[PDB]
Design a protein around this ligand. Sequence first.
Ligand SMILES: [C][C@]([N])([C][O])C(=O)O=P([O])([O])O[C][C]1O[C](N2[C]=NC3=C2N=[C]N=C3[N])[C]([O])[C]1[O]
Length: 883
Amino acid sequence: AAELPPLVPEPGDAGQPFPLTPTQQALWVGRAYGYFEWERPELDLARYRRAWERLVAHHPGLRTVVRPDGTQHVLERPGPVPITVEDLRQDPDAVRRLEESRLDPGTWPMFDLRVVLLSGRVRVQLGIDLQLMDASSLFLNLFSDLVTLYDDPDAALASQKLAFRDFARWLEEDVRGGARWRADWAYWQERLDGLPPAPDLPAARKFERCMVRCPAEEFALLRERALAHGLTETELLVGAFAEVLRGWSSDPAFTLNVPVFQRFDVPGIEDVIGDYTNPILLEARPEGRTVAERIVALAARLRADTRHASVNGVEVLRELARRRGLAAAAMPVVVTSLLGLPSAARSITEFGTEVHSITQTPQVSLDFQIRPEDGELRLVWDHRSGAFAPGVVEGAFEAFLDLVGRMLADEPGHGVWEAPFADMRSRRDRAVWNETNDTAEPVPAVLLQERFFAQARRTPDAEAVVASGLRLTYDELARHAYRIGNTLRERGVRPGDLVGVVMEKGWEQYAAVYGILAAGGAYLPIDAASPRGRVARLLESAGAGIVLTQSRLRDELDLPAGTTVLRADTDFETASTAPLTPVQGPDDPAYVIYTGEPKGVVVAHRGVANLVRDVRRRFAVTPADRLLALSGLHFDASVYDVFGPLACGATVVVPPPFRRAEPDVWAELVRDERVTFWNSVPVLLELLVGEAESRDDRPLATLRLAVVSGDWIPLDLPGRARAQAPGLRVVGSGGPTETICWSLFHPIDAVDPQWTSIPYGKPIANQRYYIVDRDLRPRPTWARGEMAVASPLGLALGYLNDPERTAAKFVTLPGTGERAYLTGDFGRLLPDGGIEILGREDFQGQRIELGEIGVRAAADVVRRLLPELPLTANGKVDRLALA
Ligand SMILES: [C][C@]([N])([C][O])C(=O)O=P([O])([O])O[C][C]1O[C](N2[C]=NC3=C2N=[C]N=C3[N])[C]([O])[C]1[O]
């Protein structure tokens, strides 16, 4: 170690100023205060006055003021003690007037006394500055003596050696810079680059207090638990607190201010009112497998942070601001612990029983206070209401109390102690997620091509496909599907093969899909606009043989000779209109769709069929509904346009092929065919509604359902669309291609203005949406995390054939065992249950949050400005081309 210089007392010349202490320096600039309240039957005010008159002397603090020159001197003739008695005994509505309630160091009384007189009862209130003295002083000296002094104001008091002004000049001059000081600034200079920012907890873009009183018996068990791991009553208590926090914490590592109220064991200093406040920056990095392990390890780093106490935290934090940014250093999370200081003479409880007590420490968002009191350990969480999203503190406190409770119930080395983690979600956190994720419904085994075949037999007259003017009935499509599918099986389209379907938008694709499924295979959609090289590339990498195509642009297909190619509009006509029989199963693949290297997606039958018959049972999909099949069949979004409508008698309406979005034709074709179902990415319905508003007719007037998904549903768009056809119910969805087109549905009924984004929603039937930390564990509400869509049948079979990708992105959760897809999107659960979608590794997102109230950063805007934003291949918003 290193011994320190001795304190030089000065019996006199105390009237002359001494500089402000570091903990105090930081409060006298933020001005550019605590409060208590006890009750008791009768307060003898004269006695009380004289007590407080003697309490204003003795301690050189209760008189000190701050000269506006930035220094503090003592006073010696202050005035009389300003006690402000209020009277409300014969006042009815006395609780009401008492209710409305709540300072400068330039002006003597560094506080604010009061005494409100209610009927039969007296309510003593004490303001106080927090620049004036510190927590330990307040409880160990002021209150203690004040009890002594209310009892007998003339009672003997203690001889005040070496007044505080001395300690002040002492640490400032004699102690700073010396042996122990120089030794200790190294530690923090050799860790200042290892310090993790403060707890990053959720916000929601005055002071409230949860507290709990532990009885004496429960105290002592608590302490006993602490020693049995070699910890102190405050050692374990910080450790637990770190755990709770990690739950909602948006990273496991953070830094906890743990101030220490040291006086360097000076003789007589435990009787001086002063600011002995030394912050310590405890680094919380989860070190260990178990609680017992991780709490014991953080306890270690605390003590080591403590043997180096001479360098005040204020400096360390300063130098921290120097190395990094200023704001990127704030320590809003603190743990004030008056355990382990001496047992004072008197306990404020003797005087009167509390009623109110809120520390107003500023720049502190959450203040875990640990103080003992007449036998009990008082735990208290004082938190700045509005620093965090709703409930976040109510929930962590519930979870905290459980954690400590189990520790009161588990013999060390057993139970929670040797538990690898602890689920912080509160009873509601759970109730809401269970209740919103209870999606358990059996899917009837029916081949996706069988369902359609059976509706075609059910309503063969009906309009199945309307494409490029040439319409098609359900029987004529079915008959041409039989034609194709028979032809395929004949050429050996064995069960489980992939028949690549490469064409443009038209009625050829539809029959192509249902003949290929019929033939016992799965269809592999490839865009006819891709480069003449990438097409054959995807086909070769998927190992696909036969390829169906339209005859137009059939020669513009550079494919090999081992891969057969047939036209659909002609190279089929001379076939069997006799139905083929289902050879393939419900768990066999129906389509592979492709998406740093592109990955193919394998999708079953069972899941798509789950989709189809939910969407029908969600929005009452009736055969009257006529749908604008806008998405390209190579985009995952097209799948409801294939199998959705035809599986209960609706009509599919194919628009003329495009490359650039053409909301003109779309408004036309929607206006003309009485289209009632719109399905695309949000920008496409935006462009449509923009073209439609600027028209005299009502073109989009028959629309009864609009499902946007895959991008960001623009905040205004639901109203702007709801503008035309009064009665359209807009709905937004999404979920990755590996999750069967739509997974989570949010009916867009009332865009909230203070929303950064449209809620992602509640899950559909059979899919469960989880929000997990880095450990694939469920998070509690609001918490950021990655999204895990859990599902036996509504999950993608696998990533093409590469098993690495598939077993790495499709995991088993350890909480349950559910096979889940790690979406690679990050979000947070919402206390109605829905999900808020936040981006994908977008944490460095505000942007639109502070934008619409125009794109994101990288910044770009459109109305480095630019005319209008660029799209991607199927629409959305090309955030990758923008830098
Ligand atoms: C499925 C869909 N959504 C359509 O339907 C898609 O998108 O797909 P993809 O892209 O291919 O896959 C994968 C991806 O997805 C994505 N997403 C989706 N959705 C969305 C998203 N993001 C955002 N937002 C929205 N809405 C994801 O991200 C993935 O990974």
